[PDB]
Amino acid sequence: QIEDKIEEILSKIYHIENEIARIKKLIYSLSQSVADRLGGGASVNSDGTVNAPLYEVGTGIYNNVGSALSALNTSITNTEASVAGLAEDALLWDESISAFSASHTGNASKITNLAAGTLAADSTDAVNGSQMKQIEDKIEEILSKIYHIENEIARIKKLI
Amino acid sequence: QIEDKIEEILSKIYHIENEIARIKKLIYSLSQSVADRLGGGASVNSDGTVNAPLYEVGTGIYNNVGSALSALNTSITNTEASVAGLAEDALLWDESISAFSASHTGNASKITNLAAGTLAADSTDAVNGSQMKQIEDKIEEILSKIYHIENEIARIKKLI
Amino acid sequence: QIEDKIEEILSKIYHIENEIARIKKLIYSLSQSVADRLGGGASVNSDGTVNAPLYEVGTGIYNNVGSALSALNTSITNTEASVAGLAEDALLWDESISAFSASHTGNASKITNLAAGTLAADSTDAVNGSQMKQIEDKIEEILSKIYHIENEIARIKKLI
DSSP, X not given: OHHXXXXXXXXXXXXXXXXXXXXXXXHHHHHHHHHHHXXXXXOBOTTSOBOOOOEEETTEEESSHHHHHHHHHHHHHHHHHHHHHHHXXXXXXXXXXXXXXXXXXXXXXXXXXXXXXXXXXXXXXXXXXXXXXHHHHHHHHHHHHHHHHHHHHHHXXXXX | OHXXXXXXXXXXXXXXXXXXXXXXXXXXXXXXXXXXXXXTTOOBOTTSOBOOOOEEETTXXXXXXXXXXXXHHHHHHHHHHHHHHHHHHBOEEEGGGTEEEOEETTEEBOEESBXXXXXXXXXXOBOBHHHHHHHHHHHHHHHHHHHHHHHHHHHHHHOO | OHHHHHHHHHHHHHHHHHHHHHHHHHHHHHHHHHHHHHOTTOOBOTTSOBOOOOEEETTEEEXXXXXXXXXXXXXXXXXXXXXXXXXXXXXXXXXXXXXXXOEETTEEBOEESBOOOOOSTTOOOBOBHHHHHHHHXXXXXXXXHHHHHHHHHHHHHHOO
């Protein structure tokens, strides 16, 4: 049973060598598939490791998934900060009062840098201070003409 | 020392077979753990590779991490573009002047499609062109009555 | 050829043991590289598996890439929802009419909580209902003075 024992040792060694060649190929296949699922140019190195992906987020490049996710989180944070800024400063429709509200930090506020509205019976343009001042000037002139009328009348009222 | 040498060859072969069965199981365990850390339904294929994850971002499905990160970057980009649009077009509080500003691209601008404000001593409603026109009409009528008064007065002024 | 056959069996076994030690080290190197490319503190466990990353997105922690991507998708969704809210409610520049528009859901709308505008010949401040009411009161007083003038005139008109 000695030459027989050698015969089978050589055959079992042959099966082991086949397993090793199959295992070596399983490892690079695994490695390749992982590189594929990472994307961003991840590839398999000559030594069997997965070379780093290159992920572009914003103006930066990230060599791992966590750093990219973090960068996306920060971008969304910054965009939310801009949105909250707009929301604090925008002249907004207020549903509770059915109107746009020029309230700011609890106070009625001005609107300024407003160009003059068309004055017509069907104009829906807002009007400004310059336009109302011209009306106020007309009114003051009307009152002076009236005071002149009251005096001219008074003179003839006594002179009779 | 010949049968002894066989005895140990069979024992060393037995240790190698145990190592191979342990290595085969290490590879599928590694593979499984990688599938778990990727998520998105990644699983281990019969051949030992990691099947692709399916990541939903927006209206698309992405089969690798890089393509998903890219898609998230583009969504945030698009949302920032909407925000910048709002910021260019919104009627905004200007802290430097303590007031909302109807400035647009450096010019005083109109506000139009404005419904008529309540006219009362405590109204904080904006007023429109139609409302100011009605005032201007009243003023023109007042001036004609005054001119009629000046003439009636003049007639009696000479006729004495 | 029997002792020779043993000589080479021991040498082929020696090459196989070297391959196994090289393969064991390839697996932990692969594992390490995958842990590195995942980031978020992913590390290699004693058993050769990749321990889970810890990815922070918003106020949550996610133990796999898919769940993190999902969380980033939901955050961007929520930020877009805020932006669309602003866009529906903001008083906006309308390029088609070259003016800010106080239109809301197809209707001319009020602006209220507006503080009084400066009345001067170069004021670009919007004016409110309280300011226009004071003008209307002045006008009513002017008309009563005129009616008094018409009566005083009429009396002297007949009395001659």
